[PDB]
Design a protein around this ligand. Structure first.
Ligand SMILES: Cc1cn(-c2cc(NC(=O)c3ccc(C)c(/C=C/n4cnc5c(NC6CC6)ncnc54)c3)cc(C(F)(F)F)c2)cn1
Length: 284
């Protein structure tokens, strides 16, 4: 309502900054509170005025355009000067990989695993409509809130997260075990390489957060995929869900389903599982 108004910009002093989240493995992300509204938030910060600002501002610009119940929601930015902030809603249960690894399986039961996949595929159907290619879909980049609410996020983890997850490839660092063959071979990323990664994420969900391709060296993964090797069906994984994994891992990207198709399939399976679950709960 005045000349320098920007509807997304907030004053840094609006936010109480608290501790760093993720132990450094997730970069410069902090818990905060939006004081005026007594609301816990998460805040990504960039302290210095360097070339890193270009990607930080690109991230903020994308987040202003995307909005969906299962995408982490932008609340505001501080991008007029350093230190730069991106402020989002707070997801109380943290990243999905550790959630799965730490959960009570009587609570996070078969129907909840389907619910998780359904929510993620709904977010990805939306990103497919926007034609936003995520490039690093994996359980480590999803977040969990109350009542098993799951949202897709992106923490730009490839040079933050240490260990075997990301390794040197094509002058960058790739999560080899989530990467579609044509992305490994030709650096070709697309909605269909996100579909491949979603299939790996389904396997992470089915195994309560196991690392993929167990015991297989990173150096061998591409060669094996090219011979048509694919991960086996996890114990307890429904056949229909494994069929969807295998569809996501079609060698030719054009042969992989769309996220619209994937989401419809999961919504159907989830509603069926929910009926059985509600009946079982009602009994006693
Ligand atoms: C270049 C570029 C990047 N992108 C792109 C960026 C994003 N950015 C974020 O996701 C994002 C941004 C900023 C922040 C503060 C956060 C953190 C949120 N957060 C909420 N609860 C927690 C939390 N709870 C634990 C209990 C403590 N622990 C840690 N973090 C937490 C997440 C998302 C997407 C997507 F995927 F398309 F949506 C695309 C687009 N072009």
């Amino acid at each position: 309502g005045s000349p320098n108004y920007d509807k997304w910009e907030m004053e840094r002093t609006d936010i109480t900054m608290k501790h760093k989240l993720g132990g450094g493995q997730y970069g410069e992300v902090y818990e905060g509170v939006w004081k005026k509204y007594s609301l816990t938030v998460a805040v990504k910060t960039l302290k210095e005025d360097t070339m890193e600002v270009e990607e930080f501002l690109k991230e903020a610009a994308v987040m202003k355009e995307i909005k969906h119940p299962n995408l982490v929601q932008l609340l505001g930015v501080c991008t007029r000067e350093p230190p730069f902030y991106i402020i989002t809603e707070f997801m109380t249960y943290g990243n999905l990989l550790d959630y799965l690894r730490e959960c009570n399986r009587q609570e996070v039961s078969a129907v909840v695993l389907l619910y998780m996949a359904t929510q993620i595929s709904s977010a990805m159907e939306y990103l497919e409509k926007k034609n936003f290619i995520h490039r690093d879909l994996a359980a480590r980049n999803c977040l969990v809130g109350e009542n098993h609410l799951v949202k897709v996020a992106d923490f730009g983890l490839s040079r933050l997260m240490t260990g075997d997850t990301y390794t040197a490839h094509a002058g960058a660092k790739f999560p080899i075990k989530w990467t579609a063959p044509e992305s490994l071979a030709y650096n070709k990323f697309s909605i269909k390489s996100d579909v491949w990664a979603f299939g790996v994420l389904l396997w992470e969900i089915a195994t309560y957060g196991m690392s993929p391709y167990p015991g297989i060296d990173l150096s061998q993964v591409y060669e094996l995929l090219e011979k048509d090797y694919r991960m086996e069906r996890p114990e307890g994984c429904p056949e229909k869900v494994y069929e969807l994994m295998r569809a996501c891992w079609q060698w030719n990207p054009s042969d992989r389903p769309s996220f619209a198709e994937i989401h419809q399939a999961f919504e159907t399976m989830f509603q069926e599982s929910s009926i059985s679950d509600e009946v079982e709960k009602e009994l006693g």
